[PDB]
Amino acid sequence: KVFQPKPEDHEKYGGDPQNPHKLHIVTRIRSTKRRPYWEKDTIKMLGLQKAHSPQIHKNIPSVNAKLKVVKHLIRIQPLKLPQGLPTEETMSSTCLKSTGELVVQWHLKPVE
Amino acid sequence: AGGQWRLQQGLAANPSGYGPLTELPDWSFADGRPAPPMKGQLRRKAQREKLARRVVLLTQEMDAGIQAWKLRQQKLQEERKKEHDLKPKGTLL
Amino acid sequence: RTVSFQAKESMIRRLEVEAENHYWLSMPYMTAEQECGHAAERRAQAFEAIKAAATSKFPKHRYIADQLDHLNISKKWS
Amino acid sequence: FQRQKLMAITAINPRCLPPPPVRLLRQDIVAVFRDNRMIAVCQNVALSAEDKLLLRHQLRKHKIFIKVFPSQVLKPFLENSKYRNLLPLFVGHNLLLVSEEPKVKEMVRVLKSVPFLPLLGGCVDDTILSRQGLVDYAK
RNA sequence: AUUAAACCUUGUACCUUUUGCAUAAUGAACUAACUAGAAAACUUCUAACUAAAAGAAUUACAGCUAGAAACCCCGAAACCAAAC
RNA sequence: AACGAGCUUGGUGAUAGCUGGUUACCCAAAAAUGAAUUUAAGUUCAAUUUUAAACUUGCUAAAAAAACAAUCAAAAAGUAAGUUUAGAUUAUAGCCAAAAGAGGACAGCUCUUCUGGAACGGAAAAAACCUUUAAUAGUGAAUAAUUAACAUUAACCAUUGAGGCCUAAAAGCAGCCACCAAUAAAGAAAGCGUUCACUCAACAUAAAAAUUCCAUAAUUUA
RNA sequence: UCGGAGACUCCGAAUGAUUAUAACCUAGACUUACAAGUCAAAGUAAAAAUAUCUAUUGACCCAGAUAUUUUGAUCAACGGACCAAGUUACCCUAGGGAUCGCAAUCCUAUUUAAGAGUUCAUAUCGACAAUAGGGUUUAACUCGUUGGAUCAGGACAUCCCAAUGGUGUAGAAGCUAUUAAUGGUUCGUUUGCAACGAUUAAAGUCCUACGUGAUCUG
Ligand SMILES: [Mg+2]
Ligand SMILES: [Mg+2]
Ligand SMILES: [Mg+2]
Ligand SMILES: [Mg+2]
Ligand SMILES: [Mg+2]
Ligand SMILES: [Mg+2]
Ligand SMILES: [Mg+2]
Ligand SMILES: [Mg+2]
Ligand SMILES: [Mg+2]
Ligand SMILES: [Mg+2]
Ligand SMILES: [Mg+2]
Ligand SMILES: [Mg+2]
Ligand SMILES: [Mg+2]
Ligand SMILES: [Mg+2]
Ligand SMILES: [Mg+2]
Ligand SMILES: [Mg+2]
């Protein structure tokens, strides 16, 4: 029941129950120390060794099951692509915002 | 100091994150010749580039997965509807 | 002991972060069936690389030049 | 300690708000007025219960009754009746000297039995009058 | 650290030892000199020749020969022999 | 000049499961459970650990279905380890917190099982609780735990036929049985009064432990 | 030592009876440190397939037996030295240490009161209960620093002095209570501490590792 969303929940987080996002941005916010051995393994299986380092993962049921076990130790933010997926040409100009948007052009200039 | 505010603006909570302050070159030559890229930035670019490639790979795999699922439901759908031979009845078949 | 005010605020914030994590994990992009077999090819290739490393252990080549190079320690000016 | 930490974590007063928004006795007051032609209003002198009875009983021998009613329930009929000037009189403990004959002089004489008790006024022969007028009519 | 030796800030001797803790318990006044890991059956590594290896006797259904590579110190109460 | 059995030399470098000690740097990995033992101050084996080699599936997860929250486990997926062979030890007393049984279908206490820890930061105390992926130079920066807590009562009025009865005779009444009558409203009364014969209830009623305390201080600037 | 049952409390054994008598060989497994102990297809052979329950242990060495097959342990300290008891305050060395449950009656205390009761400075007690205590029956056969002297520090839960309330306080003795730690708080006899005799305004109760043995002593 915890993972069954409510209509008010969608409004607060601004996520549609349909057209779900594909990729999770997962970061480790707390320590694995003092946690049961099984929780330690899941973190290393998911690659969340260094805290405050975002990792890209699939939003699929198998990944979700592991992500739920370490639900309390991480922050999940849906990846967003305002300008679309990066291409070969723009792969070297990518930059991830704190908002969760992977822009394909990084100029370091005023937006104007 | 003031880290939550920087997030609302869309910036990096730490001022030493992604921004012109860090990523831009620290110096140039007097003539204007650009200086060799700073070692820190080269490492930072690789992580984003490596992260970018993972994003592309994962999406392609997920997209192709469901397509195969479509093919399965079709080939199976046509297989179920089938007939052959003949169907007499009564006292002889 | 009395529970501090700042402590209550800190945990409440942590509760909100985890509570949202429930929401983002409630929208699976692919169902169980659609997942099967989608990543089979990549996984098989990864294991093959692991096997190749394990079965490639063997001593290294030895060269006459390396051993004869020790004589260079006695190089001199004529 | 975290266990204790979790436990702690887990508009207009109705005062200032404006507040939302005898019948048997009524007949008794009507009954005395209908039955007794004259009603004399005298202040209740807080006489002893035994002494109060004998005065009522002694008047009962003279076929004269004593009637008393709370003032607040007595205001409505006195406001709209033949007797309307007794409203200021009917404040505090009071008694009524009620009879069937205009024995105004004898009423004072029975009142004179206890000198301390005064007479405030009332009506005699259905005519409302003050004590000063009553004495003149008593003659 | 500092302009400044001391003032200001930080800081529960060492070893052994107890459980992976000591404000314990052992040992040390200090200096100089002296004062405690040693063997090649099996294994690994390196070469010579190779159904053969070894400078006599040994081993062998890829072996055999050679090299290198290993296992401390101090201290009883006592026991026996023979003198004194 | 210390006799439960002299002293000197030799055996003798007696022996000690016991006490003490065991001298340069650097990198790396790394645990007090089961069994037997004149065994419990020891040793040996299993299990664990480790160096190398061989080649291939391993860990988490593991739907249905069994045997009943576990014993088992298939496609998957997240991910890189697991098995076999050769060599080798030390170790075999834990410590504290938090869970669950089980001893008297108890708490505790003694055990047994699972989980976690071993700061330079925080909690008057502070190896064990909470925050903390290794270690490096910088007069950079964002942060975690935490820096205690502001949480209901009143002054008012009180009516006979003396109900008879063993207590002369018992008035609301010493007393015992009846326990009533009128009354706006009264219990043969709550106490009292009375050998019989002041008032509460009613009616009417304004209200309700031992040397010497122990940071200093501070109620409002968003 | 082994095993059965219960969740440590109980039961048994170093097996006996019944057995028209139970072969050999050999895939795969259980159990397990090792050693020991379990089940078994196929093949083959006797005969016309599994002895019957309940459950039952002992190694190596070494001695016995036979015409090639077998037997030897309260080795029960039950992984078993072929065969050895006391005693030490006359002692010694190497070290390690320390220096709650139920029941079964019976007493009691408070609240119950079934009852009786009661009779001019004249009365209650109390069945039965409930609850707090103390015993008893109910489940194997002895015990674990300290007086005194000197000097005292502090606590107050006050023994005396001081200041007061109430009183079933007439006066005089008291009793009950509160506040207060200010100074004081005895000398001996019997002598192992317990009594005792005389006094005092009183002869306080306790803490300070017997308070205090590098101050002394039993
Ligand atoms: Mg010394
Ligand atoms: Mg020695
Ligand atoms: Mg264990
Ligand atoms: Mg022993
Ligand atoms: Mg031993
Ligand atoms: Mg065996
Ligand atoms: Mg067979
Ligand atoms: Mg034995
Ligand atoms: Mg034994
Ligand atoms: Mg055994
Ligand atoms: Mg003696
Ligand atoms: Mg003697
Ligand atoms: Mg003193
Ligand atoms: Mg006091
Ligand atoms: Mg004396
Ligand atoms: Mg001393």
CB atoms within 10 A of CB B41: 14
Phi, psi at A61, each rounded to 5° = -60, -40
CB A61 within 8 A of CB A80: no
| Beta sheet of D38-43, edge-to-edge order | D65-67, D94-99, D38-43, D121-124, D127-130
* Residues sharing a CB contact under 8 Å with residue D102, sequence separation 6 or more, in sequence order: D37, D38, D124, D125
Q: How far is CA D27 from CA D24, D39, D69, in A?
A: 5, 16, 11
By DSSP bridging, strand D94-99 and strand D38-43 are antiparallel
The span from the CA of A25 to the CA of C26, in Å, is: 15
The span from the CA of A80 to the CA of A102, in Å, is: 6
For residue D104, which of D62, D138, D127, D66 has the smallest C-alpha distance? D138
Secondary structure element (H or E) that encloses residue A28, with its range: strand A23-28
The span from the CA of D122 to the CA of D39, in Å, is: 6
User: Would the CB atoms of C28 and A75 count as touching at under 8 Å?
Assistant: no
3-class DSSP state of C9: helix
- Percent of chain D as helix, strand, coil, to the nearest 5: 45, 15, 40
CB A106 within 8 A of CB B52: no
User: Would the CB atoms of C21 and A58 count as touching at under 8 Å?
Assistant: no
Residues 25-64 of chain A with CB under 8 A from chain C are: 29, 58-62, 64
3-class DSSP state of A24: strand
The two tokens of residue B57 are 């790979």
The span from the CA of C42 to the CA of C48, in Å, is: 10
The span from the CA of D74 to the CA of D72, in Å, is: 5
Q: How far does Cα B1 stand from its chain's mean position?
A: 34
* Residues sharing a CB contact under 8 Å with residue A84, sequence separation 6 or more, in sequence order: A104
Q: Which sign does the torsion angle of CA C50, C55, C56, C57 carry?
A: positive
Burial of D17 (0-12, 13-18, 19+ CB in 10 A): exposed
Chain breaks in chain D (C to N over 2.5 A) after: 10, 21
- Asked if the Cβ of residue C28 lies within 7 A of any atom of strand E, the reply is no
Phi, psi at D66, each rounded to 5° = -120, 130
Q: Where are the alpha helices (DSSP H) in chain C?
A: 5-24, 32-35, 40-54, 64-69
* Residues sharing a CB contact under 8 Å with residue A54, sequence separation 6 or more, in sequence order: A25, A26, A27, A96, B51
The span from the CA of B43 to the CA of C26, in Å, is: 36
The span from the CA of C15 to the CA of D8, in Å, is: 14
CB A11 within 8 A of CB A42: no
Q: For the packed helices D23-35 and D71-79, what is the interaxial angle rounded to 10 degrees? A: 60
* Residues sharing a CB contact under 8 Å with residue D74, sequence separation 6 or more, in sequence order: D29, D90
User: Would the CB atoms of D8 and C8 count as touching at under 8 Å?
Assistant: yes
Q: Which sign does the torsion angle of CA A37, A42, A44, A49 carry?
A: negative
The two tokens of residue A39 are 């929780």
Quickly count helices (H) and strands (E) in chain D.
Answer: 6, 5
| B–C interface: beta-carbon pairs under 8 A | 20
3-class DSSP state of D64: coil
Q: For the packed helices D104-112 and D131-138, what is the interaxial angle rounded to 10 degrees? A: 110
Phi, psi at A22, each rounded to 5° = -100, -45
The span from the CA of B25 to the CA of B34, in Å, is: 9
Phi, psi at B40, each rounded to 5° = -60, -45
Experiment used for this model: cryo-EM
For residue C24, which of B83, D74, B26, A24 has the smallest C-alpha distance? A24
The span from the CA of C27 to the CA of C8, in Å, is: 31
- End-to-end distance of chain C based on CA atoms, in angstroms? 89
CA of D65 to the centre of ligand 7 (A): 132
The two tokens of residue A44 are 């290393």
- Asked if the Cβ of residue C59 lies within 7 A of any atom of strand E, the reply is yes
Chain C contact for A76 (CB, 8 A cutoff): yes
Nucleotides of F under 7 A from a protein CB: 52-62, 75-82, 115-118, 129-133, 140-150, 157-160, 184, 186, 204-205
Q: Which sign does the torsion angle of CA C35, C37, C39, C44 carry?
A: positive
By DSSP bridging, strand A55-58 and strand D38-43 are unpaired
The span from the CA of D45 to the CA of D58, in Å, is: 17
CB D126 within 8 A of CB D82: yes
3-class DSSP state of B50: helix
The span from the CA of B54 to the CA of A56, in Å, is: 7
The CB-based long-range contact list for D17-25 (8 Å cut-off, 24+ gap) reads D22/D73, D25/D69, D25/D70, D25/D73
Q: Smallest Cβ distance to B66: which of C34, C39, C42?
A: C34
The span from the CA of A82 to the CA of A100, in Å, is: 10
CB A25 within 8 A of CB A76: yes
Chain breaks in chain C (C to N over 2.5 A) after: none
Q: What angle do CA C34, A42, A25 make, to 5 degrees?
A: 65
For residue A75, which of A55, A97, A58 has the smallest C-alpha distance? A55
CB B55 within 8 A of CB B49: no
The two tokens of residue B64 are 């192709």
CB D80 within 8 A of CB D50: no
User: Would the CB atoms of D8 and C3 count as touching at under 8 Å?
Assistant: yes
CB atoms within 10 A of CB D48: 9
